[PDB]
Amino acid sequence: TAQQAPKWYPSEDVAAPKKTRKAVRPQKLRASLVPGTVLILLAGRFRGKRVVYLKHLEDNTLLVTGPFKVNGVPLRRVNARYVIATSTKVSVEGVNVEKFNVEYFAKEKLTKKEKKEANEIKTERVEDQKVVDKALIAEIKKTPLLKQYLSASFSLKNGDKPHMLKF
Amino acid sequence: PSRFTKTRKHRGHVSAGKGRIGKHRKHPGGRGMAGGQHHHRINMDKYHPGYFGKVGMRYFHKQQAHFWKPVLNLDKLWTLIPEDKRDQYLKSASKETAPVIDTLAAGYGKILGKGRIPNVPVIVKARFVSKLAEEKIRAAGGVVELIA
Amino acid sequence: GIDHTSKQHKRSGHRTAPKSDNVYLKLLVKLYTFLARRTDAPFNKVVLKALFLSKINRPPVSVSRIARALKQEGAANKTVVVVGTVTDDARIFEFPKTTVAALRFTAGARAKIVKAGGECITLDQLAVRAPKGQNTLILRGPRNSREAVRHFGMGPHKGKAPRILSTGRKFERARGRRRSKGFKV
RNA sequence: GUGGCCUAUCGAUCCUUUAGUCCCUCGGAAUUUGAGGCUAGAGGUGCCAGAAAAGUUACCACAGGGAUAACUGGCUUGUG
RNA sequence: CUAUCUAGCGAAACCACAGCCAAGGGAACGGGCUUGGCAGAAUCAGCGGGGAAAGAAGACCCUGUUGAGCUUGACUCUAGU
RNA sequence: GCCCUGAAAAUGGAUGGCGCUCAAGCGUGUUACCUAUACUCUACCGUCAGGGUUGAUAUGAUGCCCUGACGAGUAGGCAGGCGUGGAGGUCAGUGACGAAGCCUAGACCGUAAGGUCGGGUCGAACGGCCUCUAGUGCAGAUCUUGGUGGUAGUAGCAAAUA
RNA sequence: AAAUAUGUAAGAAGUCCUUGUUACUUAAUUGAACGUGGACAUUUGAAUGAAGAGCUUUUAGUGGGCCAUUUUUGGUAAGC
RNA sequence: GUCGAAUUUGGGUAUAGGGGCGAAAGACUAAUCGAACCAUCUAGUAGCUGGUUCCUGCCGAAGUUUCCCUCAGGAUAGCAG
RNA sequence: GGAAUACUGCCAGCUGGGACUGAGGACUGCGACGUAAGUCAAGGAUGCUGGCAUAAUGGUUAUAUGCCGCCCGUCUUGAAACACGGACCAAGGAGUCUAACGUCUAUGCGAGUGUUUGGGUGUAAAACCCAUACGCGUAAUGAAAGUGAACGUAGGUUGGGGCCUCGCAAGAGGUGCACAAUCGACCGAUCCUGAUGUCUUCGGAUGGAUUUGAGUAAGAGCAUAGCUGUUGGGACCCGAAAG
RNA sequence: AUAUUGGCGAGAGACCGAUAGCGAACAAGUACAGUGAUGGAAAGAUGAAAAGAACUUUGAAAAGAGAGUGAAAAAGUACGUGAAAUUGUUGAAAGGGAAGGGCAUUUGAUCAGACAUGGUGUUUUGUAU
């Protein structure tokens, strides 16, 4: 023949791993983040936009809305390390946010056969946004210039030093 | 063989294990036992003392057959008897039947007293012996008779 | 770095794994290393380290030495052991009934012993008769009797037998061996 | 007290020669000469752990040397 | 008459790789290294500073327990007479 | 004490250069800071030592596994290995449906020596493993034999009237 | 008359008590040496460390050396 | 320079290697001469020069003692494996 | 008079941010919190989510960039050298073989060992069988003639692995091979003493000696193979002038 | 009985395999050098079989392009394969008194691998795929 043989063919029955000891403890959010807070987004489709914070979800994410009537931002879920917690504070009390959870945002993943040649919304999500934004704008109208403060965007100018800025 | 020689391992190493400085040359100290009274004097004086000189008396036409006098200590003396009859002659340690031993037929010329054969009688035929060996035999009750 | 006091990666200087290819010897090793590992007896370790030895260090043993050993007191019914071979010796005529165990037996030695009612035995039977070394008695034979040793350490004023082939007058009985020819030693 | 008050003042093999024991051998067996051997010194190698030994080569040669000269260069600076 | 240009023919020595300098240090005089200066394809004719240019295992000197030639009241011998 | 005079050499010229003057100089001090194949920690390789493990059913006890320390290197020594020509054995081995060889900025393994694969060319035998054996591995030797170059389309091919 | 370097000892093969041999020694069982028997054990006789200690065989290469700190010789001095 | 002679020269012939021949230089002796050329002994000897063919791993030096017609080298002890 | 503060030092005080790594692979153990169940940051990382699923990461290769980088081999205290060799390619090419040996190692046999000069026999240079010698070894020492290894449990002392006894163990004691040191005994040589005796000049008992040996003291060798090394041989390869 | 690198004749090989092995695998002691003694080489292979290229055309001719034999002219008497130095053409890339190399990465070119798996499952055709 060509190549003779091995003396000992190693096994194939895989050994199971060891009983690990890394449980899961909930996220300890920083202090600057409290519901009713205004945030800035630093990345995403909606970068530079100011937004509201409502809820801390279970998968270490945050519930968020423009609202949509203002800036075109809907209900959404984002990550805390990709935003800023401003000092600006508004009330959110009287909002029935308890419906929402991770299953509410289900992508229903796409198969491989479905490749787009070149190139929709759920009315439930639409009307839910329509339900919440009205309760929020009623509070936004209280303090001045805030509707505009949200409609606008955030950006830096020559001389803006973030390590010396305060948000 | 060759494939286990270290010449196969010295390939690539330049000097083949003989030095860059000393340079394996042919015959740098001499050929043979040259320098015995000279530069190899210490080796001779240390490891081969007596190499230089003559000592004694010369023996023209020495035949190494007058001096054929091989020995046989009394320690053995029964190897010459086959074990077939050895135990018989031993346990019948008696007079009037003593076993005879022709050493000469075995290739032994002299008899010597290394030590301590048993107390049985024996009869020995031999060319030469020594005083102590004969004493031990006749103390065991045997005898020696000489031959040529 | 390090300030090395001793040499690094220095072998023990000792021998393991008898580098013969005698499969039966390797079996005996596979057995006695187990016994040493697990029996906490020193006899097994001794035997093991002895099985590894060369031929000059596995010297022969004579039944005469054995009988000397058995003429000790409280040692007659003991069991002898030799990690080596066992020779015969016409220089004696009596021999007791004692059992013996060793690697190799010459025909003469085996005949002598069995004729005396004893038995010549292998170490694999020894192990099952006496694993820890019950009632045993080890013997190892002389090494400095070899004819090479005579030449070991040859200098002046030693008594140490030059390396030579031909012995007689006019072969190193001259200058350096007697006063009248120069000097002595 | 085993040479000089102490520290230096001297010498191998081989060969020769002398003293001793009157001992061993001369190998077919003996005697007597003679020779050879054993032990201890002397005859000396000063290149002194010890070859037996005259020059020249500007007609020259070979192996090699920068381990080593004649130029430079370099450190040095006596002398200048 | 050559050299020069052209047609035709067409070698060799030499060649570690190659080809700008200063100073420094360094096997004490570098083309390469270090710091500086500088540096723009491909080349022609000349030149004779340099490449410690080439040429030849220095022919002077030394060593060699290598020789040879020549001499002589060296040592040892010898043909002849 | 600093500075100056003393204080003069040969290619152009060197606190390393630029350049610096309450310094980027001299003296001294307080902190922060940069970074070495050194130290610490972790992983991986190897070696060495000390150890554990024959129990049936499974392979390999010179095996598997655990612990700790260490690793520079000329001359030189020892060991484990790769490769080449050939022998004894075996693979009831490959093979004209294409062996070996050769080319291959195509791929894979190995610390490496080297090994294997694919494509191309070609056309007749060759290899893997266990052992044996030796005319056994090249960058050199002013090496040997052969061949080929840069120099270089250069020197030059010019005496004897045309 | 220093400093630095240097030798030895710091126990079990020891200490102590007793009494046995001898052709040595002594005026002498007086000693000397080697011994029998008996007591003295983890503080067994200073500290630290020990990476295992001890031993043997055999063989290679080497036997051109050089620099520096300090001591120092010759030399004017020298990368002598 | 010499050019009618110690002239120049052809052919034939003699002389052969420690030998020849030499108006003498150690010149010539088939491009070879302070001892030709060819082959053999001969792969002469060489303490001297040059070279000495694959990997990895592990250990790791000496240039110092004493003797030598020894000083460019050996034996010896040491260092190392 | 009463305090604070700095400076130095401590906490088995708290707390935030950042970087690198995630080795291992059923449990086993140390531990915390717990009434317990059990859980735990406790003997090495798991969980959640997304994109792509292809030259995108990756590899190779060429180039560019930043930093470093002197041309190899050699003798040498010291070479990049203004020290030698080297223009380039291929192929060839240099510690071998043998006689006799040492140490060490494997193997057979073992006070013996070695078949192979030779014979027999044969499937024919093979393999198989074998006698007698011989070699080496078992006895050394002396120039040689020649002599020739136990007073003793083949000694005593010290120390010794190991074993046996007692002992839970600790340890104590008995035996104590090899080996080392040492005092003795024995063989031979040398120097003495010189019994019975006697061819009256032969013999050499006995006892000794700061003497001495390559010795005995319950044998260890013989043969084959192997590396390494030694000597001789062309002797690692090439190399002279010379005779 | 013993010797035997010569001669004649046979047989074998852990030998060499065309820079090796005798100096010579071929018209080798040949050519060739030298006055001479003497010295002394290099050089093997088409293909199974010459079937070794009819014939056309360009060219003065050699030769070339076609054609054709042939399993194959990538076998054409400069012939087995047909390496390297070295060279030419094409293609790619770079290029200020060198080039080359190492660490890292960009850019360009180029390249391997895993992508199924078992599986609830029959939404099934060839009815069990």
Side-chain angles (χ1 to χ4, degrees), chain B:
Chain B
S2 152
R3 61 187 187 290
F4 307 138
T5 310
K6 318 297 273 169
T7 318
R8 308 305 321 166
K9 305 294 183 86
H10 290 160
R11 293 302 207 220
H13 304 261
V14 166
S15 289
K18 308 275 176 201
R20 301 179 102 100
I21 307 158
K23 283 177 199 107
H24 184 195
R25 299 249 162 85
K26 313 218 218 175
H27 298 110
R31 288 212 188 199
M33 281 69 75
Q37 295 176 353
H38 303 313
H39 52 285
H40 300 141
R41 185 158 177 131
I42 301 167
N43 181 277
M44 285 266 158
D45 272 357
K46 177 186 198 101
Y47 295 125
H48 310 299
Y51 191 72
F52 295 108
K54 53 168 71 147
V55 181
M57 183 147 51
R58 319 182 270 169
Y59 197 122
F60 303 130
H61 189 54
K62 197 171 171 166
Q63 285 160 87
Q64 296 288 0
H66 308 76
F67 298 84
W68 184 80
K69 222 183 278 177
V71 295
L72 182 67
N73 285 281
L74 297 175
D75 278 25
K76 299 273 161 65
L77 201 57
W78 292 75
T79 55
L80 309 192
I81 297 154
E83 76 304 353
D84 305 357
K85 302 166 272 297
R86 194 178 299 186
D87 309 350
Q88 291 85 311
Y89 288 124
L90 279 167
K91 70 190 299 313
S92 72
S94 76
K95 188 52 54 54
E96 296 97 10
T97 185
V100 170
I101 291 163
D102 196 288
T103 67
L104 189 54
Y108 294 109
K110 199 166 182 158
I111 303 304
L112 306 172
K114 180 65 77 73
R116 306 297 191 73
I117 77 188
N119 195 0
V120 65
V122 197
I123 287 155
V124 164
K125 300 202 293 169
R127 276 198 191 152
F128 310 89
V129 310
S130 65
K131 194 181 191 272
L132 182 47
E134 172 143 21
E135 284 179 331
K136 293 184 177 185
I137 282 156
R138 67 161 56 199
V143 68
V144 181
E145 56 183 14
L146 311 186
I147 60 184

Side-chain angles (χ1 to χ4, degrees), chain A residues 67-111 118 120-122 124-134:
Chain A
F68 184 64
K69 178 52 55 55
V70 180
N71 48 38
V73 170
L75 274 157
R76 202 160 182 269
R77 57 198 281 264
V78 313
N79 207 350
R81 290 287 180 101
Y82 281 64
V83 311
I84 290 169
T86 47
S87 182
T88 313
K89 194 78 218 293
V90 62
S91 184
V92 292
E93 284 69 2
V95 178
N96 189 2
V97 76
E98 286 78 344
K99 144 170 192 181
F100 303 103
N101 52 1
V102 289
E103 61 88 13
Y104 189 75
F105 312 87
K107 188 188 277 185
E108 186 56 273
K109 51 161 282 303
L110 178 57
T111 192
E120 200 75 20
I121 305 167
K122 270 74 76 180
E124 178 179 349
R125 301 188 55 174
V126 182
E127 59 84 10
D128 296 322
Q129 184 60 73
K130 198 102 183 158
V131 161
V132 191
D133 68 320
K134 71 198 304 315

Side-chain angles (χ1 to χ4, degrees), chain A residues 1-4 7-9:
Chain A
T1 182
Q3 187 166 334
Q4 191 67 49
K7 274 185 312 208
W8 176 71
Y9 299 82

